[PDB]
């Protein structure tokens, strides 16, 4: 039986921040990933 092998997902993490002088509240971009499996 034919088995397609795919390496399981990867992607860089983009971090959006304002100035640390302004705030420490930050946001995270997961790129090229539909966030159906976020946690790992």
């Amino acid at each position: 039986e034919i088995l397609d092998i795919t390496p399981c997902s990867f992607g860089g993490v983009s971090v959006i921040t304002p100035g640390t002088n302004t705030s420490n509240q930050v946001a995270v971009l997961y790129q090229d990933v539909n966030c159906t499996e976020v946690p790992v």
């Binding site: 795919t6 390496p7 990867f10 992607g11 860089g12 790129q31 090229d32």
Partner: peptide, 26 residues
């Protein structure tokens, strides 16, 4: 008239450009 794979598996990320095709037409 202007036309390897869509998926690459070793750290080859093509990034989306900031300015989309629609607003360049705008």
């Amino acid at each position: 008239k202007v036309t390897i794979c869509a998926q690459k598996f070793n750290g080859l990320t093509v990034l989306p450009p900031l300015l989309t095709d629609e607003m360049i037409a705008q």
